[PDB]
Amino acid sequence: PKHVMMMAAGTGGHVFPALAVAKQLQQQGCQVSWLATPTGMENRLLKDQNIPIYQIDIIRKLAAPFKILKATFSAMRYMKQLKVDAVAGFGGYVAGPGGLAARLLGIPVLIHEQNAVAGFTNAQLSRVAKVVCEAFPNTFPASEKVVTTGNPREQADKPLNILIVGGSLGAKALNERLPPALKQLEVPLNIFHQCGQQQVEATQALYADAPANLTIQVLPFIEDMAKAYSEADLIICRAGALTVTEVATAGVAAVFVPLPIAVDDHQTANAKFLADIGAAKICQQSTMTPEVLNQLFTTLMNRQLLTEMAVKARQHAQPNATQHVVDLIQKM
Amino acid sequence: PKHVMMMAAGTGGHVFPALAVAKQLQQQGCQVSWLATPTGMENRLLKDQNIPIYQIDIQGVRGNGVIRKLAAPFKILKATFSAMRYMKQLKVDAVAGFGGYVAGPGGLAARLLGIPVLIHEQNAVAGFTNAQLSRVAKVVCEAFPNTFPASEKVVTTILSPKWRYDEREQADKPLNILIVGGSLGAKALNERLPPALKQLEVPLNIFHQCGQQQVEATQALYADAPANLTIQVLPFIEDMAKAYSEADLIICRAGALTVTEVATAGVAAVFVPLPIAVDDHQTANAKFLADIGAAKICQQSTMTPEVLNQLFTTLMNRQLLTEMAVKARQHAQPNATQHVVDLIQKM
Amino acid sequence: PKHVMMMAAGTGGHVFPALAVAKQLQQQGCQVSWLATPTGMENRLLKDQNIPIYQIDIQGVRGNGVIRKLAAPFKILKATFSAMRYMKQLKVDAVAGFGGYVAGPGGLAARLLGIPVLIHEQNAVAGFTNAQLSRVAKVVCEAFPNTFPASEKVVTTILSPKWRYDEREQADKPLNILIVGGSLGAKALNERLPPALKQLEVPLNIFHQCGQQQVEATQALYADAPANLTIQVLPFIEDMAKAYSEADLIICRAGALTVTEVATAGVAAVFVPLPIAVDDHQTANAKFLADIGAAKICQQSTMTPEVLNQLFTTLMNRQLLTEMAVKARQHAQPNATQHVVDLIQKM
Amino acid sequence: PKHVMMMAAGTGGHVFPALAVAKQLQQQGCQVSWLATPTGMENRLLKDQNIPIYQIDIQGVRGNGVIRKLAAPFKILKATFSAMRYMKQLKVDAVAGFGGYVAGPGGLAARLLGIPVLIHEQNAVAGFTNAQLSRVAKVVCEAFPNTFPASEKVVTTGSPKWRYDEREQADKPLNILIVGGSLGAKALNERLPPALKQLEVPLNIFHQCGQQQVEATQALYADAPANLTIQVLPFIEDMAKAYSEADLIICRAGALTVTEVATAGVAAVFVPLPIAHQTANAKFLADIGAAKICQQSTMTPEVLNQLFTTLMNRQLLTEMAVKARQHAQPNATQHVVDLIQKM
Amino acid sequence: PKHVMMMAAGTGGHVFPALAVAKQLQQQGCQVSWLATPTGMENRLLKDQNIPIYQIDIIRKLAAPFKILKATFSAMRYMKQLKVDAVAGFGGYVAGPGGLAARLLGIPVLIHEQNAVAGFTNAQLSRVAKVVCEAFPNTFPASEKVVTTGNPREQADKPLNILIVGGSLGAKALNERLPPALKQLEVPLNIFHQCGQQQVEATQALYADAPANLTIQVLPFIEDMAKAYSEADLIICRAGALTVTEVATAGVAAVFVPLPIAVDDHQTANAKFLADIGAAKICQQSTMTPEVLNQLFTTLMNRQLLTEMAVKARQHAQPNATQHVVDLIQKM
Amino acid sequence: PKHVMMMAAGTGGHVFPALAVAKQLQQQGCQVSWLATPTGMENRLLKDQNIPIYQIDIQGVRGNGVIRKLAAPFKILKATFSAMRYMKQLKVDAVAGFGGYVAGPGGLAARLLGIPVLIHEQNAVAGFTNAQLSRVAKVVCEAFPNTFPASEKVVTTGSPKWRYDEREQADKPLNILIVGGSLGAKALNERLPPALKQLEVPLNIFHQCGQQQVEATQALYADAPANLTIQVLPFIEDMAKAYSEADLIICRAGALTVTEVATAGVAAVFVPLPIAHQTANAKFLADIGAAKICQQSTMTPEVLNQLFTTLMNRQLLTEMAVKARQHAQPNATQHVVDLIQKM
């Protein structure tokens, strides 16, 4: 049986696409192992997932040029003992040391970058990777890289369903500035607003001042996220990597308010995928004012416009990425 | 009869657009003052520039043993009032800020006095101090078209290179590629660029800028096989304007003002944007011309001998370089330094 | 018909004077809002206080790996506009700030909106954010008389302990000294204070507050020789008001509000001010009553068994303690919490 | 009632010998007090130990809005006098300090008052506080002989069956005991199974893994363990049992654990912790004794077999563990108490 | 001959009073040695002063509780070799370790604090000092401390001589805010203004706008400082420790603008010595506005008021501190 | 024309042996290249050395307004590939790395390409980069024998008169040579004069003080120097002369200076630098040889006399310096060049 070792850092949501590839690999007769750091976030996520996790190097401090050597040989020892046959790393630092360790052992490397702007380790690692999977098309240049995506409205005069998702986090900026310029919209709306935990009371006050024609509901979490998508006629949310990939895979018109201070503005680069082809608008948080909000929503409240947006979005997406990546790993 | 105070930080290239707008404001009968930090490089750049510089302090003080550490956030409040006193004492009539940290405190200080504020952002992605300041500014100049959302003018700063087709219509000329690495010289360009250039089977004329004390190093890389290429290595370019017009393809850092120069002269460009730029802003500057179809962008990180050759193989056609250079010159905004001066005066 | 927003930082004891002024503003028909930081302790103090708290961010972000480090000075500009949006959204009619970092950004934000600002400084030496903010505030309340130079009111926050002579005129009472170490307990007071007290040959009645989980430790120090002294050790004082009136001499940290309590009740005090206070401000608070002749100040650093006894030897006279307590009560400003509320409304 | 004050740092190693001598002093009619830092871990260890603890602060103060930033070396001066009044107030008659940061200020505090100082160093290489303090100590207890060269230094460091007797096992597989420390023991779990499961000898491997590391190493073992009867456990409840049964022990060369292996006379292959001075602890038994030392940095699965190949005969291990037990310093807790009292 | 060792840190101007005590000790038949840190500022100041300097402990970093032990025994070795007979330390960190080293050897310690608020090392060190000299009276409590000070106008209708000294430093706040509210004073003035080096051109512009009745002169440095004092009818300057002690020793009315962020506000505590007895006013820099400046100067422009101020100031000063400290050192 | 690339860190110790082997390789018809960091000091040392230098960046980037803050471990990854293309571009045939930070990235870069690696470790305790790199090195040169335990490790470290011959001095005072390093030598100036001026033997003390320390120690000496003929100098222009004349040397146990004292066969009392591993360098000559080792931390004027009392006879020093010279490894620069070429 072929033994693939996965590399994903928990911070930056690399595990969730990696987890999909690994679990599918298991079901196709492979053996999966995970290389992670101790005190890395991957450990909490992969609890109860029943694939073995291996950690490498650690109130002590060891110099940077040394710490890289300890990690590379630590991982290399793990791959040689466990007879690791191929390694797939989905980005983050852990891929760096393990990736060299793989190459030194001679086992081939597959990297997958799920953002539109290539992350630092995956850019360097791209030169020794046997295959470089890219979520978005122009993330890498030339032959080695193959594109893939990470994770898998009729009119009966119904009102516009507006969906606002803040995330597991607060996403304060949506909770605080959206109700004000939204509850002064003339058209009839149906707001389904996901606040995050400790902001439910606070923002429900922001809405209730002038409900007017439109109905409103505020909730902390959405149990069935898939239901909320199909019915939503316009979605307002962070341009995360999976969130952009989900908004595309199900055709939903969207107005992306990308995460500020994200590192290579990768969140805006994610959103700019759908934004410049014309499947979603991007409204920067820093420059967001009542006038740009209202003039953006004023022109967005035509349900036909949202459908033209949402169909272009469902077209521009790669549907079978979870199994498309698995194929590449095995043919190595 | 008007007194404008300029805010531009030296570290980023904002002093240069500000200085140009400042110089014309002076000669248009105005008096200009500069608000700058004491530890910024803008001071040396404006030495012998005949505009008075007034300083505010932004770095948090620490550990003298006679003076206790003063948190940076306390100093930013002091800088706001330090600058506010300056504008009231000097009776400043308008404040124009090109970005950098100092424009932030000074900008609030102007608004507290009631002075109107103009900000100018020279990048394609808005820098943090200008984005916040935009909410309280009277006029917002934006370099590239969709940098801010609404009600702001779109104007960016020897703009006389002739039109791209005429300058480009050459009977049997050698390709004449140009590589500019900066005042300091881009190590990443000086090595690994000659290797893929001297593997091209077409006759070209390379003029390469490596930067000081790096001349010997890059001159060595070139020497191995110049069969059909005539190469020259230089530290800096005396005349950038002529070097532009004669250039059929330019390869250079995306820069902020360099995108504007490549656009304003109409040169097909291969932008190799600066790595780990703060909001990847150099890629965004380069994506301006790239998306319209006048430049290709080739990242250092992903760049190998093979991706270089596959890019040049298709780029060594003069019909293509002209088609590119024309698209670039179309979307260029000249006489905009004069456009910003005008906006300031009507405030 | 008026909406005031309060700015008080939790770490320093500014939330307490602000909360008192806030509570009366509410019951005088106003509505009050609190501008606070997300990471400040003011939030826990105002829990279950029935005023809405609105947060602005002041600490510079760093090293997420998904989010780049954002310099603290950038965040202070964001906080100013974050707060400015809050005041405009909530239609704040006046802003009153008691010091701390948050009052700084929020204060500029109010002034940018045109909202009038009242600051209140509860120390004898002005803290940095209030000193700068004073240039742009409509009304400046100062706790102690010469804290600021001109055109500002001088008012500081169960002020009903009876007049010092009446409460002090006691027929054959034991001296009844009081020692209060804080909510946490002042290690420096709990040790080395009993040693010099139990070396006094006069009959006294010690009521000593050591603080939680420190009761056993200080109770041991006391036990060696209580021949003429009756000592009691307690963790905290349930009733501070009665504990004040009965106290003939108080020894305690100079504090900000504690100087005001010792003054407003009229108790002779020995202030042992907090070490390495930021502008030595606790000594300045204590020097208020000390210079007028109502309290002695005895520094921890210089304090030895001998200097303690030489201080108490002269301080164990009840004629002196009364003379001191009277001088302290004379310079006290009661009904000033109500005085600050009034200033806010006329703005 | 002679009044001794002890000095012990937050890290566990300094306090345990200090506690042992302190508790022994108490049963001998003395009065014992402890000098410790606040927020140091000694407090959790001395909780309910029925010694009064006195805290002296040696950590620098971080800037606060309400208090100033105070550089650490200034607090160290406060600490020295802060401690000095403690000894004058408490009428301390002698001071016994086992090393660590806290001992430095307290030791000067003692000498300034005129109190005598006894220091005890539990490592084979002298730690900086004891090194400096050696000049002002009345008596210097040294764990190992090659620590201090002075005229008045004594040698000692704070019941199982004799080695030869315990190792007389007619016929049985080699019992190998691997104790990965609580701290930094990951390196042991990672490269020991590789070379152990490639030994053609009968072994009975008892491996102490540390919590949350159990599953991972069991994966390393189950690959071709022909004849090894391996058991992996996270921590050992009764460590004393493990020693006697242990025919070869593989472990970090701690300070306390070196003397334990010597006291029980068990053959050992010490893989000293690489950041500590810890290597000098192994070289005590390695050089004049017979236990073996294998450096971690250069340690590979390939050199392990070359070391283990020669170590897998019980005669060599017995010869080793006899030499190790010969050198141990027993009744050393009581030897230090005596030195304290004659001061 | 008696051998005294001096301890002074260069930062905070401790050497200048110490230097006076030491050089006088030399002239009275003593032997003087200096204990200092390497890379301490004391070394540049004591160059060319011909008393031997000894340094102790040092891109390496050694933990704080260890660094104190190394320093104390380093100094102790120096005192034992050089047969140091008494030690006088004028504050700063170097006094801390050496001071213990002195006590451990049994040589007596004399400390001198030249500020009104006791510095951190001198406060702790006060318990083992044989004699504690204090510049200002209430700096220490009780018997051991003895007070001392560190370093040694008729009307012919002449105009008010205003003297503004910024220091070796810029003292920007005086150069920038004083000319504005001063050049709009009605009375006739004579400004002698010490700018500091790179501010001479800048501030001369600030004055020349409205010279009016009063004459002005701006200079970088004052060659003869003593001359500038006697003629000055009002002085405006930082409340340094020596500057307050100099303004007192020569009777000069003064308005102190104490150094901001000084550590225990010691500069204001220095000024408050003369300020609350009525020999000088204090105008805080942070709160300083055109209105408080003008209302302060408006009431200060009477030459009789300045004389009442300046005589009270010359009274409250200790004149023979340099020789008063030397006596204490020898009787030890 | 075999193309070797060298790897050397900014600190002087790694580069000097590297430079010696590099220059020797060049005279043997090879092509030599250097891997170094930018802003590292190797550049100043290799200036005008007629070797092409190639820079790889291993230092973390501080946040700037215009560029992001980049954590150091990320730059280390860039460095490894940044260096790797250098070797592919320059057609490097073998890599010789003498330790330090730069060697780590370059060594992986070599192995990834398939280039062979030779490392050489100049200390007696193996440094971390060479320790890890030992697993992938084709040949491991070790300065001292007890560094690595492998099958393919060799022993060596990069003209004056034989000891016995040079020490045959009919009648003359003991020439004592004290070289305080350029770095951290203050401790030597401070406690050597005390115990030297209390020796009742004829000495001729030559003391190397270091700049700006000259006057201070001369004060320490002039106090009762009865018979010592002392000379203090800041630095020694001709150090080779000082060795031959030196009858006892007192000095820091550097890495290069240990092998120099051994090569010239001079008796030494090593006071190793206390923060370095430097102590392990002295123990080479101390243990199997006869030069003496005196720890700095515990070092007092009182133990110095007890050490010097026994060291002041010329027979003992000669017996020592003969044993030290016996163990030196000469023509070791040429021994490393040979190992490089057979790769």
From TrEMBL, chains B, C:
GO BP: any one term: peptidoglycan biosynthetic process
Alphabetically ordered keywords of this record: Cell cycle, Cell division, Cell membrane, Cell shape, Cell wall biogenesis/degradation, Glycosyltransferase, Membrane, Peptidoglycan synthesis, Transferase
Gene3D superfamilies, per the entry: Glycogen Phosphorylase B (3.40.50.2000)
EC number: 2.4.1.227
Domain Glycosyltransferase family 28 N-terminal stretches: 4-140
Catalytic activity: di-trans,octa-cis-undecaprenyl diphospho-N-acetyl-alpha-D-muramoyl-L-alanyl-D-glutamyl-meso-2,6-diaminopimeloyl-D-alanyl-D-alanine + UDP-N-acetyl-alpha-D-glucosamine = di-trans,octa-cis-undecaprenyl diphospho-[N-acetyl-alpha-D-glucosaminyl-(1->4)]-N-acetyl-alpha-D-muramoyl-L-alanyl-D-glutamyl-meso-2,6-diaminopimeloyl-D-alanyl-D-alanine + UDP + H(+)
Pfam family of the protein (one): Glyco_transf_28
Any Gene Ontology CC annotation: plasma membrane
Keyword Lyase: no
Cellular localization per UniProt: Cell membrane
Membrane topology, as annotated: Peripheral membrane protein
Stretches assigned to the Glycosyl transferase family 28 C-terminal domain: 177-338
Main location: membrane
Sequence positions that bind UDP-N-acetyl-alpha-D-glucosamine: T11, G12, G13, N123, S183, I237, A256, L257, T258, V259, T260, E261, Q282
Pathway participation: Cell wall biogenesis; peptidoglycan biosynthesis
Keyword check for Cell wall biogenesis/degradation: yes
Sequence similarity: Belongs to the glycosyltransferase 28 family. MurG subfamily.
Function: Cell wall formation. Catalyzes the transfer of a GlcNAc subunit on undecaprenyl-pyrophosphoryl-MurNAc-pentapeptide (lipid intermediate I) to form undecaprenyl-pyrophosphoryl-MurNAc-(pentapeptide)GlcNAc (lipid intermediate II).
Name of the protein this chain belongs to: UDP-N-acetylglucosamine--N-acetylmuramyl-(pentapeptide) pyrophosphoryl-undecaprenol N-acetylglucosamine transferase
Gene, per the UniProt record: murG
TrEMBL record, chains D, F:
Cellular location(s): Cell membrane
Keywords assigned by UniProt, alphabetized: Cell cycle, Cell division, Cell membrane, Cell shape, Cell wall biogenesis/degradation, Glycosyltransferase, Membrane, Peptidoglycan synthesis, Transferase
Membrane topology recorded in Swiss-Prot or TrEMBL: Peripheral membrane protein
Any one GO cellular component localisation term in the record: plasma membrane
Location of the Glycosyl transferase family 28 C-terminal domain: 176-334
EC id: 2.4.1.227
All residue ranges annotated as the Glycosyltransferase family 28 N-terminal domain in the record: 4-140
Gene3D superfamilies tied to this protein: Glycogen Phosphorylase B
One annotated GO biological process: carbohydrate metabolic process
Catalytic activity: di-trans,octa-cis-undecaprenyl diphospho-N-acetyl-alpha-D-muramoyl-L-alanyl-D-glutamyl-meso-2,6-diaminopimeloyl-D-alanyl-D-alanine + UDP-N-acetyl-alpha-D-glucosamine = di-trans,octa-cis-undecaprenyl diphospho-[N-acetyl-alpha-D-glucosaminyl-(1->4)]-N-acetyl-alpha-D-muramoyl-L-alanyl-D-glutamyl-meso-2,6-diaminopimeloyl-D-alanyl-D-alanine + UDP + H(+)
Keyword Transferase appears in the UniProt entry: yes
Molecular function as annotated in GO: undecaprenyldiphospho-muramoylpentapeptide beta-N-acetylglucosaminyltransferase activity
Positions bound to UDP-N-acetyl-alpha-D-glucosamine: T11, G12, G13, N123, S182, I236, A255, L256, T257, V258, T259, E260, Q278
InterPro entries: GlcNAc_MurG, Glyco_trans_28_C, GlycoTrans_28_N
Enzyme class at the top of the EC tree: transferase
Pathway: Cell wall biogenesis; peptidoglycan biosynthesis
Purpose: Cell wall formation. Catalyzes the transfer of a GlcNAc subunit on undecaprenyl-pyrophosphoryl-MurNAc-pentapeptide (lipid intermediate I) to form undecaprenyl-pyrophosphoryl-MurNAc-(pentapeptide)GlcNAc (lipid intermediate II).
Similarity comment: Belongs to the glycosyltransferase 28 family. MurG subfamily.
NCBIfam families recorded: murG (TIGR01133)
The name this protein goes by in its record: UDP-N-acetylglucosamine--N-acetylmuramyl-(pentapeptide) pyrophosphoryl-undecaprenol N-acetylglucosamine transferase
Organism of derivation: Acinetobacter baumannii
